[PDB]
Amino acid sequence: TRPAHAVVLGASMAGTLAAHVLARHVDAVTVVERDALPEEPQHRKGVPQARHAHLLWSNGARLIEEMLPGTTDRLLAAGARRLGFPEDLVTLTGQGWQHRFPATQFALVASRPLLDLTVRQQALGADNITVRQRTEAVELTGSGGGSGGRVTGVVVRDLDSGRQEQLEADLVIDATGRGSRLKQWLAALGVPALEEDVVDAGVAYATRLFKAPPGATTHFPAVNIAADDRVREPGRFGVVYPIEGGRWLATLSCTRGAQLPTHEDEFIPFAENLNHPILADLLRDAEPLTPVFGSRSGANRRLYPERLEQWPDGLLVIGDSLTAFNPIYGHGMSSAARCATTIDREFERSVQEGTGSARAGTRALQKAIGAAVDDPWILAATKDIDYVNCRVSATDPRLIGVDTEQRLRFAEAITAASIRSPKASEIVTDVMSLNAPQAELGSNRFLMAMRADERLPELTAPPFLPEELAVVGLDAA
Ligand SMILES: Cc1cc2nc3c(=O)[nH]c(=O)nc-3n(C[C@H](O)[C@H](O)[C@H](O)COP(=O)(O)OP(=O)(O)OC[C@H]3O[C@@H](n4cnc5c(N)ncnc54)[C@H](O)[C@@H]3O)c2cc1C
Ligand SMILES: [Cl-]
């Protein structure tokens, strides 16, 4: 019959959105979060990735705005910036500088603690949501393996008292992120292993927070620098994003085989060694506020519970626990929002009575969630699969059934069109913002746009406007 109590494990972006949506369809929702959740925008140990630059692409932003009206204005009122693409970015691709065409998509940029707080404030206020902070999910309860498995609840431990308690539930949602213990919980119930795809280019991140030149966060673009991506060499990248409070977040990254800064005096020289040194020129006199923070969470990985015949009833997996991506493409929060939107749109259809058990509904929900995360998976995996020394363990025929040399040729063509042809840039910006599938770049429509559109002359300098150079006090020469 119909769920009366849902338990959500984890209260970051995926779990907070999921709890909001589930409270609309289920009598009572409990949220279990290991951290204390701050009432001010502060970093916390359970989301260490929030130290690094975050873009909320228009796909995720619109889905959050639909679920939680007013959120976008609250973010802008608190200093977030709406960055139009490509218009508001100075971007060097492996094919040249991006012409700054009038924006066709956007992303919201704020410090990740402000985004998270603003969302929580909107989403966890409902009267039928109970948030248990400083509480750790320990294992799942129920039975697994052949025929009739079901999850009936969760063992939780209060971290202040050390006391463990059994939390019964009709539906359990794992939103505990890339560090989820899900595989261990499933093995303990007797559930067989999940199918999983990996495309792991060994990407790593190094980030410093800076005080920006006054006014740069409002009147100076974001800047994104990529390698010429010589076929046999690791990629190296850098981005500088404005966030609230007149600060710049600078995130440097590379793929397997290149070295990232780990000491502060190594940071600007890495940016100096990118294909164009502009990031170093911008940061050279900016005031650093933090040491270098690192991340090694850069692999693309995807679990396929929707394929497991022995998936247990009453269990859903969402967010980074289900699938996680190379952060350079910026889709994890959008993918989290898609998971919650999909639950919202499919919950009633899936749980309609008639089958006599929760199996049909659980499996139908997890199958719809699986379809919803396909776009960020195939985008990021396609972009990473041909890096030198990339580790590929995937069954996806879109990836493993195609000629590598053909894919490389396709990719250069798409990039070359996007930077200098406005009609191509619209379609590519749609895909890069997670609003059209990667498959659209192989369509008749896109190929025709690539062929028929004008192509502007190559840019020979970063396309800053004069008013922008004035802000940071640089000279075109
Ligand atoms: C370097 C880097 C840069 C990124 N940049 C971007 C970007 O630009 N744009 C974007 O959209 N995404 C970006 N991402 C991805 C984004 O951070 C995540 O997709 C997003 O946080 C959603 O993840 P989540 O809610 O599923 O899990 P997480 O955010 O990882 O949170 C999981 C939650 O579960 C809690 N938890 C864990 N274990 C337990 C337990 N046993 N019991 C209870 N609670 C538990 C944790 O404390 C945490 O609150 C980036 C990621 C990284 C690493
Ligand atoms: Cl991290």
Query: Look-up: residue for tokens 């007013």?
Result: 70
Judge if the beta carbon of residue 175 lies within 6 A of ligand 1. yes
Termini Cα distance of the chain: 71
The separation between CA 90 and the C-alpha centre of its own chain, rounded to angstroms, equals: 22
β strands within 46-194, DSSP E: 55-57, 81-85, 89-93, 96-97, 105-109, 129-132, 135-143, 150-158, 164-168, 171-174
Amino acid at 325: F
- In this structure, the answer to whether residues 398 and 319 fall within a common structural domain is no
Structure-determination technique: X-ray
Containing structural domain, residue 442: 381-452
Residue 305 DSSP class? G
Judge if the beta carbon of residue 55 lies within 6 A of ligand 1. yes
β strands within 175-295, DSSP E: 196-200, 204-211, 222-226, 236-243, 247-254, 287-288, 293-295
Contact 386, 404 (CB under 8 A): yes
Cα(236)–Cα(274) distance, integer angstroms: 7
Tell me whether residue 462 is in a domain.
Answer: no
Domain count, the chain: 3
Tell me whether residue 343 is in a domain.
Answer: yes
| Beta-bridge partners for 249 | 209, 241
Judge if the beta carbon of residue 30 lies within 6 A of ligand 1. no
Cα(57)–Cα(66) distance, integer angstroms: 14
DSSP 360-397: HHHHHHHHHHHHHTHHHHHHHHHHHTTSTT-EEE---H
Cα(156)–Cα(34) distance, integer angstroms: 10
Three-state DSSP class for 178?
coil
Residue 313 DSSP class? B
Token couple for 474? 């640089």
Token couple for 13? 């972006």
Tell me whether residue 74 is in a domain.
Answer: no
Give CA separation, 223 vs 248, 252, 283, in Å: 11, 12, 11
- For 1, other C-beta atoms within 10 Å of its C-beta total 11
Cα(431)–Cα(239) distance, integer angstroms: 20
- In this structure, the answer to whether residues 310 and 179 fall within a common structural domain is yes
Among residues 346, 379, 412, which one ends one of the domains?
379
Nearest CA to ligand 1 atom 18: 332
Q: Which of 176, 251, 292 to mutate to test the pocket of ligand 1 (most atoms within 8 A of CB)?
A: 176
Judge if the beta carbon of residue 11 lies within 6 A of ligand 1. yes
Judge if the beta carbon of residue 332 lies within 6 A of ligand 1. yes
Look at strands 323-324 and 300-303 and give their pairing: antiparallel
Query: Look-up: residue for tokens 């409070």?
Result: 245
- Exposed, middle or buried: residue 199 (CB in 10 Å: 0-12, 13-18, 19+)? buried
- In this structure, the answer to whether residues 269 and 405 fall within a common structural domain is no
Atom of ligand 1 nearest to the CA of 13: 25
- For 152, other C-beta atoms within 10 Å of its C-beta total 18
Tell me whether residue 255 is in a domain.
Answer: yes
Residue 34 DSSP class? S
Is 247 annotated among the ligand-binding residues?
no
Contact 196, 303 (CB under 8 A): yes
Output the CA 14–ligand 1 centroid distance in Å: 8
Is 24 annotated among the ligand-binding residues?
no
